[PDB]
Amino acid sequence: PVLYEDPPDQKTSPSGKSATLKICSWNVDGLRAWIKKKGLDWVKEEAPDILCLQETKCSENKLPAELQELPGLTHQYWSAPSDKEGYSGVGLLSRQCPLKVSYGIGEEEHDQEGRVIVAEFESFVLVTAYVPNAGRGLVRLEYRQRWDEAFRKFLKDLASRKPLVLCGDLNVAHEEIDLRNPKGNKKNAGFTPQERQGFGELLQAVPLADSFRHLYPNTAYAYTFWTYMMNARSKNVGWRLDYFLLSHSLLPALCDSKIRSKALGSDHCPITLYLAL
Amino acid sequence: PVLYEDPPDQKTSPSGKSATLKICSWNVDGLRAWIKKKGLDWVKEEAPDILCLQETKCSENKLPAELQELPGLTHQYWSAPSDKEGYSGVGLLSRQCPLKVSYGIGEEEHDQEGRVIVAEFESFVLVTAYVPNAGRGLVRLEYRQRWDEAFRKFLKDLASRKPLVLCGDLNVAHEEIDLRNPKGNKKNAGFTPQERQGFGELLQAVPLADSFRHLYPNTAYAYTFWTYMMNARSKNVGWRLDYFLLSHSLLPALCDSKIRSKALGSDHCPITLYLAL
DNA sequence: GCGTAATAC
DNA sequence: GCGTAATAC
């Protein structure tokens, strides 16, 4: 059906400033099978300054050896669930050394599934996240609302002291333009009133801006996730669940927020952010 | 390799008393696939007064309709994990109505996985259990030891007021005769020193007697579980993990403790107990 | 429900 | 590790 071709990368700030930092985020949905699907040859080409991975499904002991073979991303940090083995998990790889690296959001109820790494750098503080899925039948919908409130107060406090960049799978399509089939999904995980109101309260509270919508407020059919079933990806029946939210003070540095719709290895695709620090 | 033919059923007490009650236990390892594997036609033939199922892997909402089509086992009771969906789970079906039915062992740490049903009858109190597996690599070995102590104090208190029958997957081979390959499994879940000492402390504390060993103290190669891998069952490379433990006062009623080595539908086989109440 | 990656045992 | 039954998403 309908198509989307991501525009060419703009590497120049609105004030003419050239791009310094290139961040990349990707929900790999199985880091080991992603590695097996030649996913790591792709990021070697993208050459990002920072790499954020979500849904690694891989305890820190089982990490493949080819991760230690990325000559430009040697500082690697991982978070994993306390108990469950092939579930959730996030990772943050960096070309430069972070000043401080912290894990989780400071409330033990939400820190048992390895969902958040916080990497503080010189000019800003990066946060990569993998928000809990409300799940089919919406069993975790009530829990998800408790998470969103505590995650918002956690982010609001970080931005209080330093410019903030949130990134990763946020497991919500903000608006009707952010998914292919809006009407039939008002009662499904990812496009419920409560999840969408929560994303809205996030932008308003810390505060943050959706990078992609700030540069392309009216671009439709631009998705980051496609269900493996029903040939969803070949038909571009997708969802935009992967984001880059910036502090308002960082918008003069924003050069481009990209969506690599063609990169394989996962039921998500990578997203890239160009900043000028 | 070596073989085992379960002897014919003895339905007469040592004191000449005839059999009243016929209990049956079976770790079905997937109640729905077990039903699909014609497992329920088997128990219709066995015609037991009570049926105990372990590792149902089936929440109470997803129970098949053919369970309500057992005309001789209409009183059905189920336990399931609080959160995990296709994991653990035990069930107790009965021809007669129990006086009281309780769930779990009275300590919330061990009651979140649906492992114990307690059914009090007129002459005795039946308990069916599915003991936590220490797991490959023995991650739950320390937890398993905490369970065994609390499960023993729970059983010791039940037998304090009524004769007791424990049954189900106890996830331990007591002695070297209770598994095919004793030497190579001293460091594996099911035949560790700690698990075996725990089973021993159980028999001594409440107290209880292994029905099968009381009637066949020297019968080897008699297993209830066979790994699905390595063609373990066709080679009788097995483990005796499924038991019937009685209060000492009930031994004059014991007629026979059986092992149906030939019944399919699971990587465990059913066990049957004949009592004369 | 259906595709895929990981599980416990 | 390998067979099988169930998972989350």
d(CA B137, CA B110): 21
Q: What nucleotides of chain D have any atom within 7 angstroms of a protein Cβ?
A: 1-9
Nucleotide nearest the Cα atom of B113 (by C1'): C8
- The reply to whether B184 Cβ lies less than 7 angstroms from strand C is no
Angstrom resolution of this structure: 2.7
Nucleotide nearest the Cα atom of B188 (by C1'): C9
Where do we find the tokens 């309709």? B65
Q: Which residue among A49, A130, A256, A274 is the active-site one?
A: A130
Which residues, at least 6 apart from B205, have a Cβ–Cβ distance to it below 8 Å?
B152, B153, B155, B156
Q: Which residue among A49, A169, A178, A256 is the active-site one?
A: A169
- Secondary structure of residue A254 in the 3-state scheme: strand
Q: Which helix (H) or strand (E) holds A204?
A: helix A193-205
Angle at B169 between CA B164 and CA B174, to 5 degrees: 85
Where do we find the tokens 């049957």? B272
Which of B170, B182, B141 shows the shortest CA–CA distance to B241? Answer: B170
Q: What nucleotides of chain C have any atom within 7 angstroms of a protein Cβ?
A: 1-9
Which of B210, B64, B70, B54 shows the shortest CA–CA distance to B133? Answer: B54
Spatial contact of B237 and B180, defined as CB atoms under 8 Å apart: yes
Nucleotide nearest the Cα atom of B84 (by C1'): D7
Show the domain range for A27.
1-277
Tell me the C-alpha to C-alpha distance, in Å, between residue B110 and each of A110, B25, B114, B134. 22, 22, 9, 14
Which residues, at least 6 apart from B88, have a Cβ–Cβ distance to it below 8 Å?
B55, B56, B57, B80, B81, B113, B114, B115, B130
d(CA A274, CA B276): 80
| Residue B9 known to be catalytic | no
Q: Which amino acid is at B118?
A: V
Q: How many domains does chain B have?
A: 1
User: For A138 and D8, how far is CA from C1' in angstroms?
Assistant: 12
Which residues does a chain break follow in chain B (C to N more than 2.5 Å)? none
Nucleotide nearest the Cα atom of B225 (by C1'): C9
User: For B240 and D9, how far is CA from C1' in angstroms?
Assistant: 38
Q: Per residue in A175-204, is it b (16+ CB within 10 Å) or e — as a string? A: eebbbbeeeebeebbbbbeebbebbeebee
Which of A81, A79, A71 shows the shortest CA–CA distance to A118? Answer: A79
Helix spans in chain B (H): 31-36, 39-46, 141-161, 193-205, 211-215
User: For B228 and D2, how far is CA from C1' in angstroms?
Assistant: 8
| Residue B157 known to be catalytic | no
- The reply to whether B135 Cβ lies less than 7 angstroms from strand C is yes
